[PDB]
Design a protein around this nucleic acid. Structure first.
Lengths: 92, 108, 93, 84, 96, 79, 89, 104, 103, 89, 96, 79, 84, 94, 91, 107
DNA sequence: CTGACACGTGCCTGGAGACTAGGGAGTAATCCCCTTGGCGGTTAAAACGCGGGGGACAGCGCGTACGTGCGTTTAAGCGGTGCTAGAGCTGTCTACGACCAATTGAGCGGCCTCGGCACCGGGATTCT
DNA sequence: AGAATCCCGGTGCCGAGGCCGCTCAATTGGTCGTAGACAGCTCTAGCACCGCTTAAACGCACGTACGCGCTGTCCCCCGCGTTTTAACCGCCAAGGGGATTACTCCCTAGTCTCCAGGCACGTGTCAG
DNA sequence: GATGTATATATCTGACACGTGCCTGGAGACTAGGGAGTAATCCCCTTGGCGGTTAAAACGCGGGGGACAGCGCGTACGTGCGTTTAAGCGGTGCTAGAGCTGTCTACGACCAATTGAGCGGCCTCGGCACCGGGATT
DNA sequence: AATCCCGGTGCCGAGGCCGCTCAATTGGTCGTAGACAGCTCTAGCACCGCTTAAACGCACGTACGCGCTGTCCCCCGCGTTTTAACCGCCAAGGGGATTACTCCCTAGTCTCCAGGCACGTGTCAGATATATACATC
């Protein structure tokens, strides 16, 4: 089975524009976009772990990779989202 | 044994924390993976998805259509002055171009 | 119509549209030709030729936008081959 | 005994006029078309060579679209729309 | 006695392509780097080699941009490079 | 105001190495702006590497890595 | 610190036994070797995963060598790669 | 004990490349023939660089290789330059290359 | 499993080894001689026939006849060197008129 | 009268599919094979004799091939014989 | 009446006979000449039917080769007609 | 007399095959002479082979071997 | 470090004139020398390649004149005097 | 002296004389120049150079003979490069 | 040790011209001349055996090779003294 | 109980037994008949004598008493049978016969 | 006048004297095919005549190409000191291919055929 | 205008190609004599380099002999016609000698011997 | 006419090139078990072949708006000098923090039993597209 | 004349329900490496006097980019022809993709010893200095 992110993109779509559907061509574009940014971030997180002789990728590595890869305002809001997520998950 | 409550529902996310943690471990990025990596990554991927779709739906509404198609995603990505930087090398099939005529070409 | 009255209309027309513009069959026969150098007995899946066509058509549209900027810089409206050769050199091709 | 012959005239001059019209080109010296085919040919040679290299490593005889997508990514001009 | 224009500029070009020393001064660049960096974090500290690696990268980048600028300049059939030549080169390169 | 330390002669000589025979008088301030942008886009990465390491001293490996991620790999100060 | 600073010297003695090398240029050579090593290992790893394979064999190195190096280098490199492997085996 | 590099007839260390592979995470397995092949490739490219650098040195009648000779090497072979285009070499300078329209 | 099928050849390694031993060329014959010789004879056979069939196809005929072999051998700029003294019965000549003779 | 005709016919059916061969051409080929066989075995014998060796090996046949055939044919003939002897080994 | 110009048919003869592959000397007279020569070296000889064809093929190939060499010698001499001196030079340089 | 059985038109046809457009009329007796010297050589060798075998018929192999010895090998008749 | 530059002038024009003056030559066109040196180089290459082939088969590093004699003999131009 | 009288003297001489006429040392370096393209660091017996020189002088003299015949057939006395080419072609090496 | 014919050419020279000497170069030439004609005759003798599917070389194969290779006036005198030698030997 | 050489049986100077040995070791055939080496020796002796007689007469024409390669060239190139036997051969030190073409000599 | 030829010496390994084993060639007889022999007829080709203009080749003209002669200069040839890479020989032994045998299926000679070619003819186009 | 080349179409045959029998030349398992792959020595002659020598390498002036060109002409070969003869096809004869066979032998390869022919090594004188 | 870089002889001082100790990285060998090589299959989607009509492609016309070759001009920047200033050098001085050794415990690699979240499939019904006509630019 | 806009037809794609199974969850041990504590010794920052190479401001001269002008020729807009693209129907079979058996290849482990990496050395390659030649404009 070819696992895909399609159901999750569809859930997200129905929270910003509840009237709108999406064609399979656009769904396949989104499905490629997710894989691309996943690979880039995991790449830089790996390098940052290796250079400091640490064995481990933690939340600090992902934060630093995000600040390196995304433009500044996107990095700010991404960090705010990840911080809120990890804080509320820790509070659980 | 407690009734399961998926980690996405502890984080308050729709993206699959389980799958993204699996893919972090299996992808040979590093020999150990901490529990704070996948929640953060899935949160950022959700953020970027919703970011793109919010502009694409506006383009779709101006087309007076109920459906998003690649033309509208091209409009969204190329109109945002920062998403154009992240995806500057990417080319989208069936996307076409933004209307663009240099002022010198038009008549007086 | 006056010269270029319709050239603008064609620009406006085709930039609005999203269809492929090369004839599929000749493009396919050229792909099947060029492939013949690196091996014989090659076959192409139906989607592969479309992928190639999309790639080449977008490549060329990008080259032509760059060429147009070069021509305008030259204080000209017509694009000429020198504009391609400079475009490619600053790109480092 | 079936063997191909040159089809380089196959990319019609009208087709290139339509492409360049998507680039917003207004006026074009006629010498352009044969240069433009030459450039296109060098491009196609590159991409196909890479594609074939992938096909061979897998011991396939059909070229698959993933071969093309990977070759394009290695060249650094990523194509979205065909999986991967 | 006076040389005519360009002949000594020609001597300069041949020299500086023959010579291979760094051409930006160390101390002013060292302060400029400190001034820029402190806006990201105060009380930073620098290895003496990191400044030299920066100066090497900056010199190489500017030399390459000026090469492309000179090609843009000869295309317009000028010999003087113009600010618009820099802007065009930067746009076609895809950084502008 | 340390950017004035990139003097006009230091610019001219780099233009000479690039082959420029004749230099317009407005080029210098544009060149300074371009260099300031490049420096900021390198130093921000260098300092991000410095901070993740918790170091307070910047190391030349950080500058090499800032160039390498940005594509402009440098040989000589490390490997 | 590990470095390649023995083996470059050996090769130099084979190529030009009268000639010396500055430590700066030895450092350059060390980084050149590390760079091409990382490129080849990267593309070998990619070519494994596309085929859902688990190991790197000589074939993945050979295919990466043909993909990355221009055509005249690629022939001679693959020739002496297979010559080395036949001697080893 | 007899070294694997002397088995292969190579100067570069087979065992060091084999170790560096296994610790680089590039794959969960490494096949026995890979590090020999990779060492041979790296030795070939090193030899190719150094030969040109040496001939550049003796053009100067210098006898110590310095980075200017390596820049003169890389920028004068059309295959090496294509392999090494995205790279800056410290102390390397440029090739003397005035454009023809500029000369009188 | 015939040695031709170990070598991957159609030519008869057994026969060519027999003829090497019986032909009084030398008092001992090693096992690497006949495989190499049979391979090279196969190669040159296939080489000639590949050109000959092209001429045959241009003749729009299904059959190779000596005229086609002569066209093959005399057109290839290196086989003409190997077979430069050889003459082929029923072969004829390549069309050849000196430019000075024509109007 | 043993002949090479069946082997030529097999080879023919690997290069051209629907084409047959007349007996006149078959007899020409049958003479060509015998001629090149005799020439190569001749020079291989001389090379063995001059070095005071008793034996014709693969080296003698290789050297004779490099002497008798033109250069490009010699290259591909050596590549064929090398591949054959390697895979046979 | 119709009449071609001199040599109009000569070229047509060349084009016709280079295209074909038949033997051109009369078989019976040639066989009689063969039997007349052989009578010197022995008496009451006989010839197999293929032997005379082999001789005729050899002799016709020999003469065609000599004639091509003669034509090159004649053209060298700045002439179109072949004359006996061109045969005698061709044979001398060939070492006959 | 049998030397005149090789007729003038046969010589014309052979000269035509070899690309000869115009022929002086003295060529014919010289050509008959050259052919005669060639035939004498080949037949002398043929008979010599026939005699060593103690045969009375000339065979095609005798001609093939004689032509090989003279160095102008014929393919087509076995051997 | 030594690598030979051409000695193409080393076979002096006097030397070629002295050879030609053995072969009956009253007179010599001035364009003969270039064609002669070309012919001579071709011949030398065609002999040395064989000689070196024999040298290699024997594994010798020193060329022996018997190699040259055999190179001539296989090529048909047998030489009497330096061996037998 | 008028043209050809001394050339006649030279031909009579050098058909009478029998020494080798190329200089040893140049021919030696030209061997050392060409062979290296097949294998560098070749070594030569001193006789092998002499055997080469003998062969090359005999070959060239014979070519010049044939050339001179070709020259007289054109009713020239000057040997021309085309005479060499034709001679070589009829000989069958071109 | 090298074999050579350097005795026998001298003996024949003493029979033909007992006043005359010979240089070592010309003796070497004679040695190669003898080796050459020997190899020609032995070659054609071997050919003439195999065409008849015979196994030996007899006097007949030498005689036929002698008639094939040597021009006509040499061939008669050579064959005469060949058969004279053989009749003396066998008697 | 006594030994007498086969060449002295044959009345030849050349060695019969050496030719017999050289044949058997030359692989030319798997058998050698007893009469062959006598015949072959006689042929070689005949040809040697024929060469040396002419060389001697050439030496006497120079009033030299030592034969040298020039005289062997003078022998071979002046007998129409010897030249036809030995056409494909270069003799060291031999030079050429003085042989100006008639058209070249003045009127 | 000086050293290459022409002679003299030791000695060892190549040849000759004799007996042996067994198979390549000489022999007598046969078969039969393919070679030499004769004959008819028609009709392709060769032979003999005509017409004539395009070729071979004999002549005058001409301007330049290179043969002959000199002063400059340079490096090919000579005698020599020096070394050591590798050519050439002795010793060890073991990797391998010559030669046997029992076995059997790959390639040759034969009959049959059926369809690709060749032989046949008619109409359209090229080219002189 | 109209002659020859081309091209399109139909008839029917004899050659290539398939199947078949079958037998002899390729295969596998095997021993063992050896010569050639490797180890070591050692002493030739090849390459590097020094100074001296002057024969030959080199550039130049210059003079007229030679190759290339235009022109003519006449005679002989090419293109065409009518006659006629022996080539070519095909049928019927028949017998010489190529090609095969079974018996036989006398010729040559193999072996041990021992002794002397001629091949290194030392010499000096008379041809150059 | 006269200023630029090239080349030759000499000093001298430290970067290269060598030699030493020794330790931790590699090699020799045996082990366990699973990633890849193999033989056989299915079937789909690729390449084969045909008709017809009609969009697309091709060839010609007309011609005036573009490319670009020319003369003019006034100012913008290369060249050259005297003034002055601070980058580079050698040095004294310190101590923030970079780099190493030691302790131990917070945590994440890997197992297992469990089960419901996401994929492949059928169905459909209505949003889109295909169609056409009349108004406006 | 072309773009726009308003209206009708009907189909094949998105979207719902459905089965279901395999990849996520929870409870758990335990080897460790990395968080913290302490040390200590490098080299970075701070400060001093000396040096003179470089930077700076200015004069000035003419070479260069920008402007107006012309012209001719070549594509852009339009027409008629014609050809092979495009659609769609019918064939069929090669090779992508899946599977069950098997093995021989690589990771894991202990060893011990020597390769090469710190630490000590010194000399000859080079920079520097002085001298001066001839190429260039």
């Amino acid at each position: 089975r070819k696992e895909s992110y399609s159901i999750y993109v569809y859930k997200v779509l129905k929270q910003v524009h509840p009237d709108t559907g999406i064609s399979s061509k656009a769904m396949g574009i989104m499905n490629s976009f997710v894989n691309d940014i996943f690979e880039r971030i995991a790449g830089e997180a790996s390098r940052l772990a290796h250079y400091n002789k640490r064995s481990t990728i933690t939340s600090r590595e992902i934060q630093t990779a995000v600040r390196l890869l995304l433009p500044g305002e996107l990095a700010k809001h991404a960090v705010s989202e990840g911080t809120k997520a990890v804080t509320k998950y820790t509070s659980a | 044994r407690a009734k399961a409550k998926s980690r996405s529902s502890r984080a308050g996310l729709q993206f699959p924390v389980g799958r993204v943690h699996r893919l972090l471990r299996k992808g040979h990025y590093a020999e150990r993976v901490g529990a704070g990596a996948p929640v953060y990554l899935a949160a950022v991927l959700e953020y970027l998805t919703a970011e793109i779709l919010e502009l694409a739906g506006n383009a779709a509404r101006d087309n007076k259509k109920t459906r998003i198609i690649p033309r509208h995603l091209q409009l969204a990505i190329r109109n945002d002055e920062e998403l154009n930087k992240l995806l500057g090398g990417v080319t989208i099939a069936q996307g076409g171009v933004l209307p663009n005529i240099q002022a010198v070409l038009l008549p007086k | 119509y006056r010269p270029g009255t319709v050239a603008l209309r064609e620009i406006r027309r085709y930039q609005k549209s999203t269809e492929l513009l090369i004839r599929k069959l000749p493009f396919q026969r050229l792909v099947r030709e060029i492939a013949q150098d690196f091996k014989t007995d090659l076959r192409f899946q139906s989607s592969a030729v479309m992928a190639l066509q999309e790639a080449c058509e977008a490549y060329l549209v990008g080259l032509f936008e760059d060429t147009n900027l070069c021509a305008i810089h030259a204080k000209r409206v017509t694009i000429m081959p020198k504009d391609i050769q400079l475009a490619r050199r600053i790109r480092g091709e | 005994r079936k063997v191909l012959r040159d089809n380089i005239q196959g990319i019609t001059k009208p087709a290139i006029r339509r492409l360049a019209r998507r680039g917003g080109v207004k006026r074009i010296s006629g010498l352009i078309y044969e240069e433009t085919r030459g450039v296109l040919k060098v491009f196609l040679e590159n991409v196909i060579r890479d594609a074939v290299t992938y096909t061979e490593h897998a011991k396939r005889k059909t070229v698959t679209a993933m071969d093309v997508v990977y070759a394009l990514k290695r060249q650094g001009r990523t194509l979205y729309g065909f999986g991967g």
